[PDB]
Amino acid sequence: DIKLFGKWSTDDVQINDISLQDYIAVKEKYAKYLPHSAGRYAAKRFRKAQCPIVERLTNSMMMHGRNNGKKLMTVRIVKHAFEIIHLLTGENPLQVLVNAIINSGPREDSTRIGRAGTVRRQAVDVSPLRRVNQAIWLLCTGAREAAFRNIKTIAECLADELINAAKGSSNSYAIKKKDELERVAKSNR
């Protein structure tokens, strides 16, 4: 009924694991016509959980100095990327994004201060909110270094980054970084 960007109904999108279903916000209560709403989502802690993840991706995709207010450009980038992934795969772009987020969130990490063995002294599992944040950050970063110095534009780079991450193919920078973090944490157990 809401049809983000005029299509791609949100009701058929399914979150495959209960770990992040309280933090992914594609459901009908958070279904928005357009990923642009100055909703004051950073005013209080945990308020970004009820912010739609399309808005989260739009907010994260505008980085590296040149791009800090160009949210309209980021929205058009997201729209073109969703068009591209719909053509390339045939399924819901929001479903592709949700699968990419779930497969990109690193399940555990390592952090400490002192005489670290390999990277950090202890291996630490992460929270679902940190999972979503890190996944979105990794996807946008992978798209950015994919699109920096080649003719392939940022729309296609984001699109195929999400496509590769949604399945899991080691061709996406997000899950390459995720696997590196998994190895580091497993060694630092």
């Binding site: 309280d22 945990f46 630490v124």
Partner: protein
């Protein structure tokens, strides 16, 4: 041979640790055996009632 990943829900949040506050230590209750509950340190923002994956079951329990 490796232990499968298993889910567990945060019941009570013990408090920050790691000496920089970078980790919060919580008490977490397993899905399969609700009577089973351990203490785990997790990084990132955590509020009680949310569920999270355990790649390995028992790592470290230490009251603050």
């Amino acid at each position: 041979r490796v232990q499968p990943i298993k889910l567990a829900r945060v019941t009570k949040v013990l408090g920050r640790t790691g000496s920089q506050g970078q980790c919060t230590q919580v008490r977490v209750e397993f899905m399969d055996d609700t009577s089973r509950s351990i203490i785990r340190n997790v990084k990132g923002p955590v509020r009680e009632g949310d569920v999270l994956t355990l790649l390995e079951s028992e790592r470290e329990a230490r009251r603050l």
